Amino acid sequence: KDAWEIPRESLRLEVKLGQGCFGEVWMGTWNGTTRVAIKTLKPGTMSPEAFLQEAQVMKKLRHEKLVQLYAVVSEEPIYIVTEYMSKGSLLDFLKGEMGKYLRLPQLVDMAAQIASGMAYVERMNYVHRDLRAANILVGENLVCKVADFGLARLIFPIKWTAPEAALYGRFTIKSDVWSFGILLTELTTKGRVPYPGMVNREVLDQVERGYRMPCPPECPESLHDLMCQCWRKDPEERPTFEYLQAFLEDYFTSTEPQYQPGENL
Ligand SMILES: Nc1ncnc2c1ncn2[C@@H]1O[C@H](COP(=O)(O)[C@H](Cl)P(=O)(O)O)[C@@H](O)[C@H]1O
Numbered sequence: 001k002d003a004w005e006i007p008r009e010s011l012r013l014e015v016k017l018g019q020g021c022f023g024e025v026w027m028g029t030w031n032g033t034t035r036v037a038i039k040t041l042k043p044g045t046m047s048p049e050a051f052l053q054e055a056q057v058m059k060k061l062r063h064e065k066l067v068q069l070y071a072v073v074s075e076e077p078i079y080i081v082t083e084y085m086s087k088g089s090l091l092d093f094l095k096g097e098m099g100k101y102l103r104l105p106q107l108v109d110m111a112a113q114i115a116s117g118m119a120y121v122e123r124m125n126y127v128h129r130d131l132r133a134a135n136i137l138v139g140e141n142l143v144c145k146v147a148d149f150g151l152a153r154l155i156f157p158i159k160w161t162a163p164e165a166a167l168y169g170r171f172t173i174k175s176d177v178w179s180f181g182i183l184l185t186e187l188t189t190k191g192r193v194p195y196p197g198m199v200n201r202e203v204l205d206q207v208e209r210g211y212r213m214p215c216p217p218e219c220p221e222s223l224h225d226l227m228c229q230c231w232r233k234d235p236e237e238r239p240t241f242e243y244l245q246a247f248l249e250d251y252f253t254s255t256e257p258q259y260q261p262g263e264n265l
């Protein structure tokens with residue numbers, strides 16, 4: 001086994017953070033000094049090598065805006081140890097008590113961080129395939145990091161998935177760019193489900209017919225125009241994450257220098 005392995009007694013699971021049919025997520029301590037997130041797999045509910053799939057990708061990716069793998073216990077019972085993100089999922093964050101104070105400058109900076117993490121994914125010729133607010137983690141000082149690479153690979157919820165990927169299995173970094181556009185609407189609506197009042201079948205039907213979500217209330221048209229670029233029918237016409245990162249970093253000087261705060265954004 002490799003250098004990622006740790007002894008089981010160096011890990012202490014303290015507070016349970018979440019649940020599932022396939023495992024648990026705990027806040028804990030590693031080597032008695034390091035605060036960590038610990039992911040477990042429940043015996044014989046899923047294949048051990050299917051559970052380890054996410055860890056294998058995380059071994060190859062290292063970037064300040066991706067959740068970092070720390071250690072692994074690779075024989076059953078399996079544990080996955082990652083950096084601890086104190087504020088939980090971006091989706092929960094946006095929906096909860098802290099949502100009501102976030103304004104456009106915070107939300108756009110969070111989008112810029114996510115674009116930076118995805119620009120690294122882009123540079124590395126990887127695809128994520130499940131980019132959405134539920135798979136972003138939030139830390140102190142509004143730090144946002146991309147997580148859940150369980151489906152990530154080298155070169156599905158229809159509301160976040162590009163049509164060519166959902167229909168024809170065409171997953172590329174450009175279908176992740178599509179998903180990022182949907183993530184931007186989650187950020188600017190404080191975590192609302194996209195395409196409100198539409199079930200999956202209408203969504204499929206409508207998007208192929210040319211329907212796109214309108215500009216969210218109090219969202220500048222220029223930011224909605226960025227969403228529409230991410231949602232171009234032709235995947236090759238969508239911007240790069242490199243472009244998206246630069247656009248969002250410079251947004252309040254180059255694109256909306258006359259922004260003024262409103263009631264919600
Ligand atoms: N590195 C981390 N630091 C802090 N909290 C984390 C964390 N990873 C997950 N959590 C929390 O545990 C919850 C569920 O975890 P999860 O990884 O998203 C599902 Cl198992 P999933 O793989 O999607 O099926 C999240 O809502 C987070 O709230």
Ligand SMILES: [Mg+2]
Nearest residue numbers: 089134135148
């Ligand atoms: Mg998740």
